[model samples]
Target chain A: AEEFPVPNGFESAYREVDGVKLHYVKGGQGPLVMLVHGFGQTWYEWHQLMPELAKRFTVIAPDLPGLGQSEPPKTGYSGEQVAVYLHKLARQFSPDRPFDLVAHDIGIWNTYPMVVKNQADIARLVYMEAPIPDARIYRFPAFTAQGESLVWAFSFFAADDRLAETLIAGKERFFLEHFIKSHASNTEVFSERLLDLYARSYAKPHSLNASFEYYRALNESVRQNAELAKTRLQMPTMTLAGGGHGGMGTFQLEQMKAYAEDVEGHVLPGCGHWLPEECAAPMNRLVIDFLSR
Target chain B: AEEFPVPNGFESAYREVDGVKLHYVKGGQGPLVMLVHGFGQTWYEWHQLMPELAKRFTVIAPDLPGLGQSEPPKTGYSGEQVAVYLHKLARQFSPDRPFDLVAHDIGIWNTYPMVVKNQADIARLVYMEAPIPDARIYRFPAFTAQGESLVWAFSFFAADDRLAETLIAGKERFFLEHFIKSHASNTEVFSERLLDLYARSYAKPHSLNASFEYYRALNESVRQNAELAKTRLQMPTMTLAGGGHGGMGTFQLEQMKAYAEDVEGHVLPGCGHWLPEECAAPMNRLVIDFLSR
Candidate 1:
């Protein structure tokens, strides 16, 4: 699927927003439902879960700026800025109403701002395998079963542009494969086809750079989230953490409870960071249930 | 030095306190000046300049519990705990007096409590290659030159004890030497004898585990230091950062200034994290100047 034709039942689309020539995959039909993906992933992360969700709701999964086939940004990468970047997409597609929200990884961090602001375009949300942007949690804890490996990825990608790029430039498969193998509960979920799909996107010189830029902007995100947290959305929200990578079970749900009035948390045991792929069945069931509710 | 001897001119002593047998090297005479070496290092860090420091000031460098010749503790590795442990040392050595202090890395974190308390035993203090223990600055800025390296060490050592030990136990030479070599502006500073000295100490069965305790206690340190910061130190204090490793120059001094009435800052032009030896002449001179003033 690297450069292959869009798979059955999926329509490809694009739009220019906040300087990103955004790309997305949409399937199924009903009320608007947007699936925001994490870093090193694309709308394709939702591909496995899409047909099922598509059976009930309109699903829009866009390639975040600088990842997948999406265009890179001209400037600005902080979570708050990226949130605004995402808003432009929401406005273009569902200009006047909230969409049931599903996001993971970097997608969750960037989307948090919109949730805090209670954007008209976000009805409810689900978070997966992501970090809480608490201002106090500066350095990720060192000794926990959680995130023992992600610390390196943040810094490795966040390394000086030239240094990180020079290393990652031609080694997309090696790098992406590690993310899949190291974190996924079922490595097979990231099949040769999917790996090829990701490598081709990351193979672009700016792809990894843009990915790193998200990390580069994390400090700003921390500050932004701390401020956003004060607003405290009362909207229904759910938190899902994997048991494989940064698998903190309901710990994430507890954190989300601080910022939302109604929240639910689940631990996807034997799963990894790539929830949408590594454990798509449960993710689909959870998403459809939450949105329909 | 790996398995060699502690060499001549240094006398060793031990004290049973803080749930461990503490070992120290003392070879100076004037006023009491205590040197607290950081993680993965020992009192031997002060060997190079002890003679000179011995001339002008009485010096005592202790192996922090769980490091060097000091026996590791079964529990209580928090910075507050270590600070209390150092106070017990101070009480044993000079119950009725204050001493000038020189500390680095974890040493600085643990020592801050003494400074914050305005303990008369600490006539003055100097921090080296240390983080402020403030909870605010979480992830090191990828754009910055600082911690582009240490973030890994802190995280690596901070990893779960089993995984870290499994990786670090037998590879002490490679790991310890790298810390010296990678950060030293002058690689020659870590002579073969010196490398052996550190390697042997680090090679101790529980050394890496104890070393990680320093990192394990970081979150508590942040909370403790935040509390400590409320009480400003009236004593003159200084900050020295390795220009080669955590080279923050005066930026660290600025942070210190937040908690002290007077603060001096310097960046060792060609030094790494191992200040007591990497650049001893300047350290001796600076310590003398700061304490004498």
Candidate 2:
């Protein structure tokens, strides 16, 4: 799909957001719906849901800055600054209307700043599979199966500015495949085609390093989230977590209840961390139903 | 040193300690002194101090279970359990007398339990380079250079049973060399001879995984240390931290103050995490002075 044409209706383009170049896929008509993706993925995470959501609303699925086809952001990878960068992208597309925000994994982290900083600019929010940076994460026990499941990456990726990239340099496919496969319960969801596509993108120079930058900025993001959380989010929010081994379980829902005034949540039973791809049917149906009302 | 002879005075031998075969270097005469080494190291960590300390006392330096020449223990890797295994070894060597305990890195961790459990058996205690796994470690921020330095390994080593070993399979020399060099201020201390020695040992099948077991047992060790810390240590305890990057700094000394009644500490100026080798002269002087006193 790198050089191939995208779906018939959807067109991909690069836009200059400040000094950084952002890549996104856009289509559909009606009010705007922004779909942000997580690590090891780009806008394509919403491939199945993008067309369906397109039928009812305009969908803008963009790779987070410095990831996938996007160029590195001029500003650092703090959630607050990344929030500023993404908000500008949203407003550029639809200046007059408030957009619905849907994100999974690190996507939620990047978009969280938008909800807290620009509450009036958002209609509703959907967050899946990852916890927003918070004090609660530090309390996780390092040895337990459930606790170590997700947190190890937070430590490994942020290990050093260069360590992760250096160790993962020639073994991009090996590292990404193992990482993705281990966290996924529905291993069949990661076909050879999809895994190769991701591995190729991540294999590019600085691509892996750029992803690790977000983790390196986690301390700053956690501090920012704490400050932003003081003023609870006013928008309606929906949280989804996978119930299997590598999933967050009730972590996101519990955090959402603390941050958002109006919240609804679901735990996809038997699902793992790759929620959108693994349980795309139910995920799409839930997003359509939630956004429709 | 694998096949070569040990020092002139020191002879290597294997002894069964509760089904765990412990390989140790024995020399000198008089009262007993037990030296516990850390990760990436066998009893050779005390190579410099061994002959000197042996001048005044009988020295027994054994590899921790499942590492070096020691067999995996019948019990698990918890500090409480490992303490029992090592204490049995010490008792086997010198049944009637108390022993001085000097440990660095995870060595501090293994021996900390001995202090808490059998305080009467230890004449004095010296810990260098690492903090006893505690709740404070979890409180460390992930984004900072200093905070992330020592902690990344805890998360990386315990990442999965197979991941660390798998990734580090053929690159044992590269991984060990980098890991050792990154934490040492005295880079010259890690001579090619020593580095190759360590790399060769760690490259052995099950050797890398066996070393990771201590980190996997971290949550249990932390809990055990917390419970064991309830009563104050009565022995003369000297906690040492390196002043340069990757060292615990004053972290160990501070922890010791809370857990031990008679505590003294020093932050070795310009030193690094590998205190025994990085600053061997000062380390030896300090140990001899303290033990003699």
Candidate 3:
């Protein structure tokens, strides 16, 4: 429960937006790069790719609103609202430059709406295995209505602090069982120290409630995205999905292509939902190559 | 929990075959219609359809060996071996009559070998959402090697009943969470009575081991099915999948159809994996229409 500093050479900064203080890590000095994380995780989910990307650009990784060290606002945050905050943060960070953005899971959902709105600050976009708003496209939990209802009720109403503590307490083993074991070919990829850092960072007060609220606002995001999709995205985008056991397999790639005019997708083999962590090297290479072009 | 007798007007009887006394509910008055249930369920899953079907042809709903009120076998109840036992039961019940056979979930995997082997007693076949031997299919905790190992180590390998009982009591929620919920539209469909029966039945001496053996025997059944498939099924088969959460959906149907000739399929809307119970009305109609023709 100690506050660990960002490694030397990286500057830790905060920006106030949408009534919350956003803590972000920034380094390097080329084009701007922003990396966003998925559910039950923080800015650190991008640890493997951050230094590598920082070499080529001013990499910006923020504790998403309500997730890590970021402060939570009184009102619930929607993806669109979060997108606006990110846009403002991007402007504050690199006022003169357009930025390359990479996001996974729920983070991708938040950023897509921003990309669609033509947030002029963003230059190129990469989305990895996020939930697309198609009911038929994704596999929902199969079981009793009561079972699903219980989960949904929890998602919709549970106090964030309680959920966060539960998650933080069992974070390492939970990630190992639910995330790593499902995808990683072996256990070596997820060292105990790495998991401890993620858990401890997220266990900070108010993090879980803020995170749960993010999911609670999903319906609103979907509605806003539906309205937003009427206008085409100007930014060139690349989407990558894992084939083995992720939200979107090859099917999601085809679906994504239908929505974005300049979108290209790659389906990685032998991976699951945690594309960045499970196959970081190849994913980083793919993102870098796309960003370079 | 009280055990309800088969409803009046339903053809119900018991038969001694292969050293096991099988209590069965019969309905339909023409050619035999046999319904087989999977793990954790009894002939009661077929209750919704059995009464309706009894009006047309004789429907024989047998609790597979070692399940329900049926006498448990001392040993040798693997799926391939169980197929032979089912064939004998089919013979005893419907001697000269060709029958339409319907099986769901684990039952499909267990009984499919009979059809694959060109068992003459079966006329038409309908399989509900069940696992095919494809290794690429989603792995639930109970199905995975780790999951199986956990069950074996915790329940079967324990020094005494204390550990097994503790694990079973604590994780009873997991079984309901994973299996029953997937089948029912709502939790109410999985009545407390049913769950109690299931828990009690599994807690019975030797029953848990028998259930675990079914999973252990899965590989052998797959191997045997592969050999039988070298000579494809000769029966007219129609597979009905649930469009709800649990049915394998259309993609799986296409995969299954490729393995057999003279096959057709339908995706029943508003139904889940527990099609026998959840969509019994429509499923009964479908079975009667397909088999009667």
Candidate 4:
């Protein structure tokens, strides 16, 4: 796998987060802030926001295992597993030290368990573009024709691995590139380099199946999220949802509203689900403003 | 039992039009009225409406191009192309003289071109449940969740042939059976043989790909329909929308009004997309009342 250079003012590091080793980029000089990226994305998704974020606070961005630079684990790749892992990472960095946490897409799924069980380590939470996995959001057509059609991909990946290996092995770029672009409001938000990095990352042996495991485990995530919804999370939380074209953004915030006591929802207009990449300026501003408040 | 078993008292026949062979069934001669079947159906879909309608009019029911006994072509599978071929069949049946037209699903795509170019060739038209192929009716999360999820099947079918042929080849029944059931409000509404006939037809060598070609052509069909929308046909046109589960009966009529001047819309209270198959008794009554006028 081609190594993406760590940005200026940043240093590369690794440590066990939840039982798996994570490759993360770290930089800046203020209080530690954690940024966890999501499915089909790596630390690259946060690149545009990194410079501005670093100016204000120390930013720690990690690639989840089974995606990007992170090595695939033998097990524990489920949403519940990743969410618990996210908590371990915060404490691992600075024992019992509270830090502002920002998570997107599948990463939000990973970090949510942290917010629910304990918030002493996280001062505030930034949740963006992820599935709620509950009854309302999980129904066949409630998710929209496009969403259901795409979720059908989840089932597709969860199907026999041999099928995916045969069809998707060589055609990784076509698959990942289209997926990345379709998730964004603007086509050009996914630069060639950005898409190539992801496709190449997923192209790694067993990486396709590994990337698919996150989705394959979504059923368990729903049960996990629904059970936890019983306890209201009172963290000062803000959900950044893209209300842009083809956006499933608001749906995330809407579901969280039911689960969290004071989850404030913000709709990012003209942006698709890829909030950081599609609307980096707005998302960065939103993240800073929310965290500051 | 004098004649060999033919479900309904109809005689099967075939005719070549536009260099493609069309398998059709006819019985009880009077005024000529054509019944064209859509995707997932052969001339068999009209079996119920045939005998009753034949009591008053000559019913010409033909399988869509490449759907049943009709042969697949190297090209020319778009709605516009199929619509043009439909007109040729009408002329081949009988010259210059007009005939009342009844169509369902993809078959409506074929019949529509005839309705647009000249209303004189069609006495009265019964347009059934199908997307109008333009900006109006082609969208996601449309026609309820059940309908939209099923409509999303079009995209899956339009994907790579290697993948589809592999997945759909021998497992045709598993695929076709659910589609047939989903289109109806009542599961038992479709007898084993009725669905088996369609599944077997689709199981043919070129059938799946050929049937898929119609959906593949729909991207172009939308453009074709939008252009045809410029000049509204003056023929007496009526639309059947299914009010049953997973039915978008009114959606069809709403869009039909935009293209036909004397267009009127009707809903099949407990029917799904397959009006003739699911609402046999009511369909005969509705067709008789609408056409006799």
TM-score of chain B of each: 0.90, 0.96, 0.81, 0.91
In model 1, which runs have C-alpha deviations exceeding 4 angstroms? A1-151, A156-272, A277-282, A285-293, B1-7, B136-139, B142-149
* Candidate topping DockQ: 2
lDDT of 1 by residue, B1-293 (tens): 22334536667888888667888877766678888888667877777767777877767888888888788765677777778778778767777778888888778877788667756678888888867677533554312222244455555455542445655555667666655665567777677877887888777877767887777667777778877788788877888877765455556777777877878889887777777777888887887787877
- The lDDT for every candidate, in the order shown, is 0.72, 0.82, 0.65, 0.72
lDDT of 3 by residue, A177-269 (tens): 433343344335667776666656655557645656666566566677778877766678888888764335766567677677788888888
A72 in model 2: Cα distance from truth in Å?
Answer: 3.4
Greater-TM-score candidate between 2 and 3: 2
For every prediction, compared with the true complex, DockQ reads 0.09, 0.22, 0.04, 0.08
**Per-residue error at B189 for model 4, in Å?**
2.6
Higher-ranked by DockQ: 1 or 3: 1
TM-scores of the models, in the given order?
0.59, 0.81, 0.63, 0.66
* Model 2 chain A weakest lDDT span, ten residues long: A140-149
| Per-residue lDDT of model 4, residues B16-125, tens digit only | 77678877777877788888888877887787778888888877887787777777653588777777767877777667578899988888877676678867788888
Q: Which candidate number would show the highest lDDT if scored against the true structure?
A: 2
Task: Give model 4's DockQ, 2 decimals.
Answer: 0.08
Q: What RMSD value applies to candidate 2? A: 4.4
Give the B-chain TM-score of model 1.
0.90
Question: Per-residue lDDT of B1-293 in model 3, one digit per residue for the tens?
Answer: 22345767775567887777776777656778888887767787887777777787788888777766666654455567777767778777678877778887767766877776755767888877765543323222211111111111211222222322333443443454444664445345666766776666555545555555565555556566656666666778888887765456785467567566878888888777677767767888888788778
Q: Sorted by TM-score, highest first, which candidate order results?
A: 2, 4, 3, 1
Candidate 3 residues lying further than 4 Å off, grouped into runs, are: A1-5, A9-16, A27-32, A48-58, A71-78, A95-97, A126-175, A185-187, A199-293, B1-34, B47-82, B88-102, B116-118, B123-171, B174-190, B198-293
